[PDB]
Design an enzyme around this catalytic site. Structure first.
Site, mmCIF file in Angstrom:
data_model
loop_
_atom_site.group_PDB
_atom_site.id
_atom_site.type_symbol
_atom_site.label_atom_id
_atom_site.label_comp_id
_atom_site.label_asym_id
_atom_site.label_seq_id
_atom_site.Cartn_x
_atom_site.Cartn_y
_atom_site.Cartn_z
ATOM 1 C CG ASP C 79 -2.170 0.641 1.007
ATOM 2 O OD1 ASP C 79 -2.388 1.394 0.055
ATOM 3 O OD2 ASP C 79 -3.075 0.364 2.013
ATOM 4 C CG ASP C 80 -0.999 5.310 -0.936
ATOM 5 O OD1 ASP C 80 -1.949 4.313 -0.726
ATOM 6 O OD2 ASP C 80 -1.375 6.345 -1.128
ATOM 7 C CG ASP C 83 -5.689 5.563 5.804
ATOM 8 O OD1 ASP C 83 -6.294 4.837 6.220
ATOM 9 O OD2 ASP C 83 -5.456 6.276 4.609
HETATM 10 CL CL CL Z 1 -5.197 1.353 6.751
#
Ligand code: CL
Ligand code: CL
Ligand code: CL
Ligand code: CL
Ligand code: CL
Ligand code: CL
Lengths: 142, 142, 141, 141
Positions: C79-80, C83
């Protein structure tokens, strides 16, 4: 002989192409031609709001992995069509896809629906993922 | 209709041109066609090791300021030759200079010794100093 | 409220630091990109590791639009940004044997990845390179 | 020994912050670039202020290769970096009535400028955008 693609130019070309692909509602998804098509796929996916992204992986031709179906409702995106060996196979296996590339050399050019930039057959293309920003000596050494 | 020049592409083009201008010892200096020629001048000056850099400032043609002499031993550098009105005057006032540009549209193209990139006459060119890197909404608004 | 603005060049520097830790390449069957954020970092890792097997997972009881088959054994999942941990938990559920990696990690996502390159504050207002482009701006005069 | 690496975009952001402080444009006869470092920032200020009168000074008892005439009254003099104060002192000597400005200032150069945008440590190992370019690098595999 040499053609250098920077990240910012690739994005400019990919955004130009995304604008031609509006409206986004006409698409079920995007298939990336791996590995070269991954970056342009991610840019088109962001511009079009498309979250359904799949791949086709082609390596004497071997298919390592492919998205199921005939491509109906799909964009198939490559970074470059070159010899036309891969482009022939993709155009054949996804005959109803809208097959696009950023860069086309002449042997691949007529096997896609759309491309952004023509490149001569014998030009060595460097994509952004092949390069790094590094110190460069003055060409003169002065 | 639109042609976007990024800073990194301008530098690539200017470095290609600097390579053609070797060896550096053949030059007394560089004259920048202001304002557009200042950035490419600074890049050529760095690549060639040339510390003697002067300007010519042209604004119905008005010369605001000019470098003295007929251009012998000098590179004269522009970012763009467009209508050929400025390029005519420069080629005339510095007849012994090596007159180069990054970009040439057809009306200006044959008035220089060398250029890097052909651009169509009716294309609106945005140079890096005209732009900023900014947030851009998804083209689809999705 | 400062913007944390990622350039293409910085994203590639971070992806390469990660690719170096994933050597040797021989140990991987392939890469699964977390769509859409993971596609660009997947293209970088795939170039750096010489990996041609790349697949995707597209997340919406966990609902997916599309997923690579299997439990992730032999795969890098990339993933980038992790969050909230929302996407991170769905990846661990679907691919418990993948090597789950990210470029960026916020503290809510951090515990749920195997590797990250750059950690940033939970509150960070982050712009990825594909959120920005060169646009005309009138002179200040 | 970290490199301080200036991007083209960051140099332009700093040049624009400076151009905003130099408004209104009407107050200036022109811009004198300190060759070679000041040429790129001069091109930016000249676009932002709509100034077409741009000249240069090329420094080697002060010896110059070339200089704009006069004592600098009405002129912006622009450099990229004031480092040792060596160039800064020659500019003050030649152009005592110019508005002498710089993008970057180290403490040895700082007292000798009218304005700067970014101050950096005296020891900073600084690379300007024209010192870097994209070059092929072999894959990590
Ligand atoms: Cl996440
Ligand atoms: Cl092909
Ligand atoms: Cl012209
Ligand atoms: Cl997403
Ligand atoms: Cl210098
Ligand atoms: Cl100094």
């Amino acid at each position: 002989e040499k053609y250098v693609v920077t990240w910012d130019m690739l994005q400019i070309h990919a955004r130009k192409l995304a604008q031609r692909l509006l409206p986004a509602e006409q698409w079920k998804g995007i298939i990336a031609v791996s590995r070269g098509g991954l970056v342009p796929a991610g840019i088109l996916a962001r511009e079009l709001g498309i979250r359904y992204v799949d791949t086709v992986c082609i390596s004497d031709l071997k298919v390592l992995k492919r998205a199921e179906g005939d491509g109906e409702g799909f964009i198939v995106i490559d970074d470059l069509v070159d010899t036309g060996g891969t482009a022939t196979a993709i155009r054949e296996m996804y005959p109803k896809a809208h097959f696009v590339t950023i860069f086309a050399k002449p042997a691949g050019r007529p096997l896609v629906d759309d491309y952004v930039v023509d490149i001569p057959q014998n030009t060595w293309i460097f994509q952004p993922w092949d390069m790094a920003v590094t110190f460069v000596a003055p060409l003169s050494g002065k």
